[PDB]
Amino acid sequence: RETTDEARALARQLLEAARHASLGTLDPETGVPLVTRIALQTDADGVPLALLAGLAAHARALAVDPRAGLLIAAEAAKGDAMTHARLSILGRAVPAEPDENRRARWLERDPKAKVYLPDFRFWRIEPVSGLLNAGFGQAFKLTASDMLK
Amino acid sequence: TTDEARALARQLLEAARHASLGTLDPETGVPLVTRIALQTDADGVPLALLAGLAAHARALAVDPRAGLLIAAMTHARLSILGRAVPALDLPDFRFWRIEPVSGLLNAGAFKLTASDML
Numbered sequence: 001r002e003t004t005d006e007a008r009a010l011a012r013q014l015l016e017a018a019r020h021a022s023l024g025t026l027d028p029e030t031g032v033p034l035v036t037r038i039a040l041q042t043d044a045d046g047v048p049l050a051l052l053a054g055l056a057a058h059a060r061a062l063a064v065d066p067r068a069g070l071l072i073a074a075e076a077a078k079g080d081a082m083t084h085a086r087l088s089i090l091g092r093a094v095p096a097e098p099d100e101n102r103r104a105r106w107l108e109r110d111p112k113a114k115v116y117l118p119d120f121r122f123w124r125i126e127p128v129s130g131l132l133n134a135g136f137g138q139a140f141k142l143t144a145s146d147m148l149k
Numbered sequence: 150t151t152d153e154a155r156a157l158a159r160q161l162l163e164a165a166r167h168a169s170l171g172t173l174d175p176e177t178g179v180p181l182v183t184r185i186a187l188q189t190d191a192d193g194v195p196l197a198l199l200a201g202l203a204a205h206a207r208a209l210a211v212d213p214r215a216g217l218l219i220a221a222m223t224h225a226r227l228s229i230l231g232r233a234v235p236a237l238d239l240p241d242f243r244f245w246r247i248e249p250v251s252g253l254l255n256a257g258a259f260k261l262t263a264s265d266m267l
Contacts, residue, residue, distance in 0.1 A: 020221040022169035024180025030250065032230040033171025033180035033216035037255075057228075057253060069180035071169050075221070081167040081184060088204075090179040112222075128177065131204060133184075139204075 007140040011132050011147050014072050014087045015042050019110050024069025025061035034061055041109055046148050048125040051116055066093040068125045088131035096122035154259045158266045161219045161227045162189055171216030172208035181208055193267045195247040209233040215247045228253040
């Protein structure tokens with residue numbers, strides 16, 4: 001339960017390795033969480049960075065209410081899904097500036113993601129809190145500092 | 150929407166073993182997204198086996214609204230908006246049906262009704 005530097009480093013290592021995630025948004029009509037799969041990396045300061053189709057369901061939800069959840073799992077893990085390490089973030093979405101360096105970092109890390117680069121937009125998901133599940137035993141509660149550096 | 154689209158949703162539903170669960174953080178209202186074991190019940194309705202003490206199980210006790218994602222971007226997947234209601238072999242774990250209101254099916258999207266997925 002008690003957060004250690006080891007727990008902090010696993011959380012940071014998951015974010016550095018992340019190419020995709022499950023994104024939680026609030027359905028405007030009903031306020032029920034909409035859970036969709038997204039391309040997700042970090043930018044320079046290690047803050048989660050999403051690439052969304054600007055008029056898709058999850059992008060429209062964000063436009064109306066920027067409250068956002070992320071699940072980040074180890075994509076390479078083998079065996080039972082429930083023993084994979086995974087990080088839950090509670091955050092707020094913010095449209096991310098134009099940047100030549102950003103649109104390039106992203107391709108070096110995800111080549112496939114040329115198809116997307118149009119109507120496609122970067123969002124920073126600024127963390128408030130985090131839940132680390134290491135694959136076994138009890139989770140760690142994380143602050144925003146715990147996840148970033 | 151079409152029969153092959155309804156058939157794809159139930160296909161993903163049938164022999165799904167885990168999912169991303171979306172519940173509402175009670176303090177902040179932010180969607181909390183965690184991984185869960187998920188099966189269908191007798192009648193094809195999503196069924197989650199959830200630890201009573203875990204953040205998500207707490208969250209559903211306060212407000213039973215629940216999202217599910219069942220499946221990286223070329224993978225067929227299914228988002229479900231629904232409401233949770235209570236229903237190896239450790240005691241504190243419990244069963245929930247996530248009762249579908251609507252759905253979003255991504256093959257390559259398609260809006261779906263509760264009965265399109267059952």
